[PDB]
Amino acid sequence: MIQTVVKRDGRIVGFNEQKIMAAIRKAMLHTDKGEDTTLIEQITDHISYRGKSQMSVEAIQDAIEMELMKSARKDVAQKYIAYRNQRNIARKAKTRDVFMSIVDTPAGMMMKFASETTKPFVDDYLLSEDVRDAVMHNYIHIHDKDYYPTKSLTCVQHPLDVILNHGFTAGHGSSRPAKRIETAAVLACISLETCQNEMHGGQAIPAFDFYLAPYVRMSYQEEVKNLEKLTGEDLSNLYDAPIDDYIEKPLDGLQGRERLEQHAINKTVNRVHQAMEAFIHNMNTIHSRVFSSINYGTDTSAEGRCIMREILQSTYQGVGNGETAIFPIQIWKKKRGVNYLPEDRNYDLYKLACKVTARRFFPNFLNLDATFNQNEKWRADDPERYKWEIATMGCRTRVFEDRWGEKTSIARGNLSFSTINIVKLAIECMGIENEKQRIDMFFAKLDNILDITAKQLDERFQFQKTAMAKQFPLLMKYLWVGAENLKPEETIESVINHGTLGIGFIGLAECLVALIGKHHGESEKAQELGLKIITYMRDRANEFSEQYHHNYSILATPAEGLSGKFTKKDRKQFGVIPGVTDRDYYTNSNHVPVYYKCTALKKAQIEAPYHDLTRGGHIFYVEINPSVIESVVDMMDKYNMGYGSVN
Amino acid sequence: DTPAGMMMKFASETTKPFVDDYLLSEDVRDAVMHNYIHIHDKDYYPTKSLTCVQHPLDVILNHGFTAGHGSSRPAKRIETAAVLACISLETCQNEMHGGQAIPAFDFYLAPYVRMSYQEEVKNLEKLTGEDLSNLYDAPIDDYIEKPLDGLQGRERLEQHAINKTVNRVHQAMEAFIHNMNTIHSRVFSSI
Amino acid sequence: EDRWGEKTSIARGNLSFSTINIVKLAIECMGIENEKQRIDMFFAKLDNILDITAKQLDERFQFQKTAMAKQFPLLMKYLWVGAENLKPEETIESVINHGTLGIGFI
Ligand SMILES: Nc1ncnc2c1ncn2[C@H]1C[C@H](O)[C@@H](COP(=O)(O)OP(=O)(O)OP(=O)(O)O)O1
Ligand SMILES: Nc1ncnc2c1ncn2[C@H]1C[C@H](O)[C@@H](COP(=O)(O)OP(=O)(O)OP(=O)(O)O)O1
Ligand SMILES: Nc1ncnc2c1ncn2[C@H]1C[C@H](O)[C@@H](COP(=O)(O)OP(=O)(O)OP(=O)(O)O)O1
Ligand SMILES: Nc1ncnc2c1ncn2[C@H]1C[C@H](O)[C@@H](COP(=O)(O)OP(=O)(O)OP(=O)(O)O)O1
Ligand SMILES: [Mg+2]
Ligand SMILES: [Mg+2]
Numbered sequence: 001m002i003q004t005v006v007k008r009d010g011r012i013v014g015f016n017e018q019k020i021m022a023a024i025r026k027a028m029l030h031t032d033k034g035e036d037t038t039l040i041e042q043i044t045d046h047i048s049y050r051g052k053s054q055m056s057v058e059a060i061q062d063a064i065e066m067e068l069m070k071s072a073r074k075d076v077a078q079k080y081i082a083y084r085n086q087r088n089i090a091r092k093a094k095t096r097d098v099f100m101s102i103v104d105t106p107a108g109m110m111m112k113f114a115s116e117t118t119k120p121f122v123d124d125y126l127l128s129e130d131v132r133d134a135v136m137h138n139y140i141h142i143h144d145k146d147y148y149p150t151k152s153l154t155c156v157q158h159p160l161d162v163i164l165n166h167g168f169t170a171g172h173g174s175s176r177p178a179k180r181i182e183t184a185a186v187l188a189c190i191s192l193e194t195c196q197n198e199m200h201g202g203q204a205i206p207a208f209d210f211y212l213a214p215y216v217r218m219s220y221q222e223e224v225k226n227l228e229k230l231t232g233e234d235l236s237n238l239y240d241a242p243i244d245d246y247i248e249k250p251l252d253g254l255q256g257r258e259r260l261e262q263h264a265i266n267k268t269v270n271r272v273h274q275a276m277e278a279f280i281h282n283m284n285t286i287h288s289r290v291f292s293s294i295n296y297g298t299d300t301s302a303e304g305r306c307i308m309r310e311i312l313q314s315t316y317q318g319v320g321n322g323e324t325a326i327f328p329i330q331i332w333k334k335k336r337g338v339n340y341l342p343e344d345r346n347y348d349l350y351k352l353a354c355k356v357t358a359r360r361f362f363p364n365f366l367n368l369d370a371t372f373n374q375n376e377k378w379r380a381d382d383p384e385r386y387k388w389e390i391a392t393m394g395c396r397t398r399v400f401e402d403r404w405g406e407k408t409s410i411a412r413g414n415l416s417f418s419t420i421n422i423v424k425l426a427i428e429c430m431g432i433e434n435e436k437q438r439i440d441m442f443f444a445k446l447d448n449i450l451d452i453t454a455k456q457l458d459e460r461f462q463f464q465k466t467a468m469a470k471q472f473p474l475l476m477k478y479l480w481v482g483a484e485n486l487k488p489e490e491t492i493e494s495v496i497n498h499g500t501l502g503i504g505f506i507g508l509a510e511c512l513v514a515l516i517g518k519h520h521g522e523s524e525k526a527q528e529l530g531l532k533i534i535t536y537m538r539d540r541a542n543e544f545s546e547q548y549h550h551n552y553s554i555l556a557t558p559a560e561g562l563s564g565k566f567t568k569k570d571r572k573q574f575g576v577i578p579g580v581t582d583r584d585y586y587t588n589s590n591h592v593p594v595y596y597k598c599t600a601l602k603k604a605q606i607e608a609p610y611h612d613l614t615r616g617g618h619i620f621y622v623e624i625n626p627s628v629i630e631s632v633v634d635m636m637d638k639y640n641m642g643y644g645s646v647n
Numbered sequence: 648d649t650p651a652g653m654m655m656k657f658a659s660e661t662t663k664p665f666v667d668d669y670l671l672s673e674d675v676r677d678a679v680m681h682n683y684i685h686i687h688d689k690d691y692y693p694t695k696s697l698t699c700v701q702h703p704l705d706v707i708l709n710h711g712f713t714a715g716h717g718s719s720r721p722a723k724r725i726e727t728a729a730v731l732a733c734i735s736l737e738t739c740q741n742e743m744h745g746g747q748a749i750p751a752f753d754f755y756l757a758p759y760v761r762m763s764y765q766e767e768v769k770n771l772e773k774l775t776g777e778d779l780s781n782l783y784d785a786p787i788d789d790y791i792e793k794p795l796d797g798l799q800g801r802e803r804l805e806q807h808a809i810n811k812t813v814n815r816v817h818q819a820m821e822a823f824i825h826n827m828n829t830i831h832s833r834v835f836s837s838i
Numbered sequence: 839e840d841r842w843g844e845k846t847s848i849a850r851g852n853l854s855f856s857t858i859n860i861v862k863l864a865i866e867c868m869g870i871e872n873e874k875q876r877i878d879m880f881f882a883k884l885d886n887i888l889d890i891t892a893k894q895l896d897e898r899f900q901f902q903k904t905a906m907a908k909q910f911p912l913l914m915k916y917l918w919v920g921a922e923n924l925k926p927e928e929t930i931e932s933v934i935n936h937g938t939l940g941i942g943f944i
Pocket of ligand 2: 084
């Protein structure tokens, strides 16, 4: 017989036959007909004679189910094998994440639930047949698929003045204009973090200098008024008194009316200083609690320089007890005639920027004079030059050109983008030995995959339109080109076309290995094909733009949600191949693989033409004194490099 | 209509039935299903949360806090104390499902009007070099406000302080009120 | 130690204890001869005796409460964890739980 049973916790107890009996009884009591001891006795006696000296709970339940199957009453087992499993899941949720297998902070868990619920429904009921077939076999990737039912857009560039000038009202919240520096950065943060809930991407504030520039004068005037309230003087000509730069130096060593004019500047500089560190800390804490970006570096006034110096000092110091802040992402604009050469006005700020970037990895650098960023309306005397300066985002996105509007990056955004798998096509075609036929097949398949991707992007577009204005309280009332003309319940079909659609690529070196023995950064013949394929994609993009009445651009994906999602599913189907499916990366859009020893010069040489070719986004990342970054910036200027991020 | 609302709706709808059919005894489920008991905030059951809490703001103000990759340092002025209070409220909201409250707001924010009044006086010393050191702990009955007309000397160089630490507090209070009222799209708050 | 207080040994003490015979169980488990089944019935009986013993201790604890503080003069008024808060008529329910209960062998 059986004498000892080991409980699940670990205790050892004696064999009681009255517990294997009540369990089956409760299972039977919910199955229409409910029987009596006639079968209970048989099952219990059969179990308690064939067993060993000591048993476990799980083994006994295995025996119970095995006997309840080999009976005539099989409607009692199907209510056993279910209750037991529910209890297993319940007792396994005290230390694990069982609820996720079926489909840490509370908010993150709820968001995971929602994402997993939404994704398959879109994958089934919304896409079309050809698109679905393409997606299933690992040919393309639709970025941010879980927000599809919400007719959402990617990002925007805030016209921050339209909110500071007048008052903004969202829901029951209302806010008046600003009248000093402290109440300006706060409103900038409010508007920057209020629009995340209306979009599924990053946020940016261009012209960080000009928009806040008028707000370094107001505090100066107020301080003068307070310094002439008690003194009885009539310092009425100090209001619009031209200034050279808001520098601060010690006060002792003067007297009279020249003593009450250096103090005001000192207090004003301190006031402006505290606000910027508050801004940085706020944006840094919000993330852990929200991508963000700010652009500056091309203002030659006296207030703009003050703001730039204050922000640079605050970032160089750090946050908290000296830690490096992760946000906001800061980007420095370089132009030939403003801040580059020693004779230019803002050389000192450039040197300070290099000093800080040598340590805290910000700001990045954006060549404002590249051959594909220049604009033919930038006038150095206008007080509104910023309207003709390119601006970029932390996601490496570019929105400059337009076939039906002006050439600006203000109050514009991106609407979607999808990446295309290219290594798989080369591996698939690898079969035939003749070289020419492999290239012919590659070009034959690339066209079809491109057509499918374009159709998917257009269908996304057609769905995104038809969204009422009220669904986006802030974006479609103050921060989009056509706002101020849209009624609360009108569709946004008349202003949506001022946007962009991207087609991204990933892993070109592997694609080259599958058609030649060397990648782009090892053999001269290799690059002649990479250039050709990128050129093919750009030409087809132009054709699609003409056909569908939209804007299309090529893209180097940021590699944030799609890093290994492609290589794993490719090793399984086709198995290991040397140097193609053996690393668990797939390299980025068009860089040189990180595992190949190469210098800065050669990498830049091989990469610049691609920068020219990819209008929708590009990068040039190099991993390592303030003089080091000078070499990087000079390298960017020498060639047509657009956006560098050395750090 | 906003994307966040739709995502939250999906989450709650996907979480309720699992709670009903996995993490409840038979009697509880029957009582729930027959309109006998209602469990407040059942969509948050797998997120083992708590509802309301009364904030000890002293620990947040005196020292700082290190959550995630963020950081902060002690507050040495009213305008940088109110903001920390708001930040604590909004950051603790995401880890619960109820409201947030601050008891004895007055006591918690009392010890910073005085620091402001000290910095304001120190600002006057660098202009009219004097001592003005009998005021750092001078006893003030009330920071009442009156016009600065009909005074002279050191008796007017002190009223000015009472007249400039009465407006920073005004701005900070109104900024707090506005900030906690714009959470419509940026939370339940009590003071 | 403690599970509802701080680590101290002042104004604290025992409440009661009981001792559990061990050898009788080994003697009873002597007919067995497998050398591995014999050692298991021992644990089988030990678990049950421990269960009943804990139940007895809890019952004695339940009876010990309901004792008015006026029948322990110089203990529930000056010498205990926190008796400066009780009254002659109040029972000592709110404070008794700072003591420890014991199980011994031989
Ligand atoms: N004394 C026992 N003798 C034999 N088998 C037992 C005994 N106790 C439990 N089992 C085994 C067989 C029963 O089919 C199965 C279910 O027992 P059950 O009493 O529901 O669980 P349990 O003993 O782990 O504790 P609980 O009281 O929490 O349910 O466990
Ligand atoms: N409502 C029911 N429907 C069907 N079978 C049931 C039901 N209740 C109990 N049973 C059967 C199957 C269970 O394996 C067996 C033991 O039930 P029970 O003691 O509630 O579970 P358990 O001991 O495995 O769970 P727990 O994790 O709560 O200890 O009885
Ligand atoms: N954190 C905040 N979030 C939202 N609104 C805020 C916040 N802080 C202040 N506000 C409000 C206060 C005002 O309504 C507006 C900013 O106005 P501001 O230029 O600072 O002064 P004001 O107009 O209130 O001053 P005055 O009292 O002289 O009229 O924004
Ligand atoms: N809006 C904000 N968001 C987040 N943290 C903030 C915000 N405003 C202030 N802080 C935090 C950052 C500072 O570390 C902390 C204390 O600020 P503050 O009183 O200016 O101290 P401090 O170290 O700058 O003092 P001081 O320069 O006057 O000696 O408050
Ligand atoms: Mg400070
Ligand atoms: Mg105001």
